[PDB]
């Protein structure tokens, strides 16, 4: 947490990618550079995208920390980060940290973004209720309970996750950027309430039903629903079914291991237009 006399940078920075960039932050010639407390305590910002940062050890001694722009290293453990207490800005994106739990007693952290950093465990977040920007696109995320208490989320993403339910968005009436495309959402009522969006995306979702039996002639409910709870009509049926409001229909002469159905509906929620469209497979038993 402090250094008590001049300390080479390299000493400090055990990895050297960041010693650069401790170096080059402070102006210094050399990581084998003599530094201060004092000097350390004058870092309000680190920007090292793209630097090949393996680890921030060393980090702990720079305690007026605000923003950390550490997009596209390779970082795994962000521990180093667990008390520095001003950390307002933390964006992460394409790194493999997956443990979350770190973050917990950054209470002023206002914008976090871990995107592409293979996290499925976001519960660690219920300790941000603070958080206002929130990205986490591209991870393999399902379960989105803890995001009930983030209420005050202006932005957030989930995009490229494998989320079906967002009943825990529905009460996040100051999002005004949404993204949840490429999931596994079939049903829109959650976001009826979101009346601030301005931005909204909804493409791509793929469903998947509970396995039914095989019959030669087949009749599955329709699960995709608008934000007023409506069925959403099919677009497209596979092997040449047909729709009768609310069912989908096959004549399946032979067995077959599956059938399914696109839909597109364009839907407007708040200020926002998006184009929900997605497919839905229902497998079949013999």
């Given at each position: 947490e402090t250094i008590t006399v001049p300390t080479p940078i390299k000493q400090i920075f055990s990895d050297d990618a960041f010693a650069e960039t401790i170096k080059d932050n402070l102006k210094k010639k050399s990581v084998?550079?003599?530094?201060?407390?004092?000097?350390?305590?004058?870092?309000?910002?680190?920007?090292?995208?793209?630097?090949?940062?393996?680890?921030?050890?060393?980090?702990?001694?720079?305690?007026?920390?605000?923003?950390?722009?550490?997009?596209?290293?390779?970082?795994?453990?962000?521990?180093?980060?667990?008390?520095?207490?001003?950390?307002?800005?933390?964006?992460?994106?394409?790194?493999?940290?997956?443990?979350?739990?770190?973050?917990?007693?950054?209470?002023k952290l206002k914008s976090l973004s871990l995107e592409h950093n293979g996290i499925s465990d976001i519960n660690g977040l219920v300790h941000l209720p603070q958080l206002e920007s929130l990205y986490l696109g591209n991870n393999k995320i399902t379960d989105i309970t803890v995001l009930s208490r983030l209420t005050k989320l202006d932005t957030l993403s989930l995009e490229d996750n494998q989320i079906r339910r967002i009943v825990p968005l529905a009460r996040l009436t100051k999002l005004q950027n949404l993204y949840l495309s490429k999931n596994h959402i079939s049903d829109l009522r959650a976001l009826r309430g979101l009346k601030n969006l301005d931005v909204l995306e909804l493409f791509s979702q793929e469903a998947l039903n509970k396995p039914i039996n095989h019959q030669s002639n087949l009749v599955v409910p329709n699960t995709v629903k608008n934000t007023d709870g409506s069925l959403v009509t099919p677009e497209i049926i596979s092997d040449d079914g047909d729709y009768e409001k609310p069912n989908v229909k096959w004549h399946l002469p032979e067995f077959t291991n599956e059938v399914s159905f696109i839909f597109y509906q364009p839907v407007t929620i708040g200020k926002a237009k998006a184009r929900f469209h997605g497919r839905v497979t229902q497998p079949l038993k013999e």
């Open positions: 084998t550079d003599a530094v201060t407390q004092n000097e350390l305590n004058s870092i309000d910002q680190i920007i090292a995208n793209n630097s090949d940062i393996k680890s921030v050890q060393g980090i702990q001694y720079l305690p007026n920390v605000t923003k950390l722009f550490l997009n596209g290293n390779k970082l795994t453990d962000i521990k180093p980060l667990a008390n520095l207490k001003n950390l307002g800005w933390l964006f992460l994106d394409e790194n493999k940290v997956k443990d979350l739990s770190s973050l917990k007693d950054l209470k």
